[PDB]
């Protein structure tokens, strides 16, 4: 149901915005992925 | 090694035996007896070059020891054993190669040039510079989508861990005239291979950005803006960037388009996003934000896009045989040899006579034999392989001793007059393709002091 | 890096062989050569796929998320 | 599979390259026919 | 017989050893 | 990027025939018949053919390049004969021919055990 | 029967090994190409990402999915999307095909193409489905995965040949050959002694009687038997790739009368 | 990479070429093409 961000480790949903730092609840590890987008990417076949 | 005669049962020998061998491969097997145990045994020295002024060596621990009380008519021609004073003898010679040469297969069969090229373009190849590559924003990267071990190899690369990450296809070569395209090396690359997904490669690149800080409290912010004052943007399209400002993975991005908002007050939006390069295009691959030192977020992006050989693009063999496509064709079109096999690469005779790159020539043999014996063929330095040893061994097979073999041009299907060197050799696909280079311009940026066009393809220029 | 499907030069399906040939040698303890032949596989084009591709992969999976 | 051996500045993976520094020896020279100087000995001196 | 000559094929099992220890990066490190 | 798109092998594209008969002038009494998307397999084929009819005095074709799938076939005949007629019995020829070898194998086939 | 006669050797479900007689050689290839690039198969052309999290790139299976082997018997009553009047595709021209994968298991899940589901409506009809010839019953493996790895798709398959790419090809080899002992001459030997000894002889030779020294050169010697042996992927029986060859061949060279026709009327 | 880390340069009396002595330490046949060549050699 939603989210952005992720533990680059414990990966587990974040999120956050503007001066809430950067950081994760328990291991700091400030890294931070982004997740996909819903919306589907087409390919081509070959 | 060390020598010493010290052996009261005959001459000379070597103070190390088949015992200190044997006691070692027991340690291999578990995976005590190390490295600084042969050298805290007094058998084996560290000899500079300034030692090596006083002392005589032996090239091979055995024929350059035993009496003389018949000579293979192939094999080379190795002058003697004409001395008894040997303090030290040479572990293996092919050690007195270093990291890139140790690659090229029978080295001690090129014009002794030929070589130090392949030592150079080695590193221009593409293959899996490491594995955690799917975790490493590093600008730029190249990864051979299938990488294979080379059919032909070296003892040397067994410490150099080739076999786990190569840099190269062992392609279906086919050394003949047709097209007349593979002319003045380059090559005819097998499309219908290519498509199969022969050499397609992936391609990462990754933009970096801060937000810059001034004590007196004034911050540069990632967001996505839009007129309101300045106007100092970027031409390309923003609606791609969420509102953290920056592409979520998935996303298509190509042009000019924007990667990352960044904005930054003075006295009220004045820009400083990071547009993908002009000329790239592709997908998304990860971004991460974190944090730098001073609390800085700090972000970079990834963009992995595949490529397809196409015809500009740069190849060679690990022999200096540095050449570009010309032209693709299919089976269709495709030499055929009766067996019904067909080529993925065909070289142009002509590129032998002068570059007299001989162990290329041989790779294709010892190749086109270990892949039906199935055993990695060893192609290491100098060794006691031949030629005949091995016609032998593909005559075992079935197919002609020497390599060639009939085939029938494509197109009609009659028989090619003559013969074609035909068999695998490794290739390795180097950096540096065509749409990389690709450059056009009809006026636009214009230098500030000079008035003149600016320099290079990435600004433009002209 | 995972199987090739398929052989480049040739064309022949050849993405299923993997395991198949792989045990035919942790198992039946086979000579590589051999093993080839009764997976099918008789033309060195369509031979050199298999006895050559390094399935990196595994050494992939191996990290984490 | 990694072998290290380099550092980790700013980001980027840096590496020292060897810095070689053959030097301090004597050596007789005949020179061609067309010359007043007829041998030298030369002598590269360097500090190690 | 735990003491007699050596062939060819029996010196890689040496260089074998050295790179166990050593690595091709030895000075760098050292 | 100035890679042509792949399926201009075979779909003719806005504005073209298969064929294009243009009259030779070299010579009397033969002619000039490009192939649109085409090639080799459907050309040297209709060559050879129809270098049979003992009323075709000359006969060759050509790709031009081969970037394009197209080409070239020039055929001569005897006065008093249209080329263009000799073109078609050649293919007929060739349809017949394999109208048999499609029956022919067939019956082979069938009579197949595995 | 009339002209060009065939004698099947061996055949199996995967090659047909076969005599061809009494043909010109032209029709010999032109045939065998024909076989090779333009029969029209069924294959992935389409792959929509949902979710994915492996480490094999997006477009890295994308390209696999399209080399999987799919049904294509009843391919001759699928109208390919170009001609079909809806916008984009349906059941009356593609196939649409799904992948769900997750990891369940504590140890590497494999996704096989066994693991791919139809959804669109086969209209009834052999088509559309992940061949198999693997003696399990898995086939083809299309990538591995470990903990919490994910990866939705949906493919839709279209027509196509090897001509707009390799992917849809049946062929994937064919065996040619033909006057094993060069009685035309079609060649010159190259040696080192003789060419007799050091070029071997090929299973072939049997079957067209020897020389016979003295005799001069046969030079009204033209061409005719040639031992193919289509092979197959799957997608077709090894049949097929040999009739529809013959029969595609054949509709083009019709196609050119047909053309020659819309062109008399002016 | 590997090949990288086990280089080595050489500042500014025929050092370019290739010494007796040079052999078993350094790598004969590995160096840059034209401009700094032999001056730049791998172990």
Redesign the interface.
Known sequence: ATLKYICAECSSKLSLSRTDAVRCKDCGHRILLKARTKRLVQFEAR | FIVEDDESLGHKELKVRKGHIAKLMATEYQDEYTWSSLLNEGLVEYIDAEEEESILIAMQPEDLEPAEADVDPAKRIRVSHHATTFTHCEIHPSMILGVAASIIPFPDHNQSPRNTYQSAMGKQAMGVFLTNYNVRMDTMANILYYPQKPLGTTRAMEYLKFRELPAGQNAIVAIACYSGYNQEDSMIMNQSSIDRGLFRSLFFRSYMDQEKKYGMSITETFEKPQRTNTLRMKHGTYDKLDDDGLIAPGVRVSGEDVIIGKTTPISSKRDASTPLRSTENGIVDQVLVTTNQDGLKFVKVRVRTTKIPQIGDKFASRHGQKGTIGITYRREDMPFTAEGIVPDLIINPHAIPSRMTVAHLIECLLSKVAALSGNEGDASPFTDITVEGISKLLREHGYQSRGFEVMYNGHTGKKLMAQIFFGPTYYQRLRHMVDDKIHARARGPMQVLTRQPVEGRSRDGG | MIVPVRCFSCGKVVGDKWESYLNLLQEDELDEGTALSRLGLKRYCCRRMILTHVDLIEKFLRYNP | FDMGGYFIINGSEKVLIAQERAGNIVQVFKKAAPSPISHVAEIRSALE | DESAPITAEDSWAVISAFFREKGLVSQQLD | ???PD??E???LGEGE???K?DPDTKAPNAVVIT?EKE????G??????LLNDRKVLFAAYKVEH?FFARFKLRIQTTEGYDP?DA??NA??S????????????????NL?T? | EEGPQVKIREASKDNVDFILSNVDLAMANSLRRVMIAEIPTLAIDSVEVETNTTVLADEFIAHRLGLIPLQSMDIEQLEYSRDCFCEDHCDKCSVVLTLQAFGESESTTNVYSKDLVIVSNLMGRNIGHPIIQDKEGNGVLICKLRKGQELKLTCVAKKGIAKEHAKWGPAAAIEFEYDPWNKLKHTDYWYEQDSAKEWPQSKNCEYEDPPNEGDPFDYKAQADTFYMNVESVGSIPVDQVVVRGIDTLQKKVASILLALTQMDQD | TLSHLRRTNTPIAKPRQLHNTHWGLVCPAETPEGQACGLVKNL
């Open positions: 990027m100035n890679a792949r399926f092998l075979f779909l025939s298969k064929l008969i192939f090639d080799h397999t459907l040297n084929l209709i060559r050879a053919e081969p263009k073109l078609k293919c007929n060739i349809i017949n021919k394999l109208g048999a070898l499609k029956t022919n194998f067939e019956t082979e086939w197949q595995l």
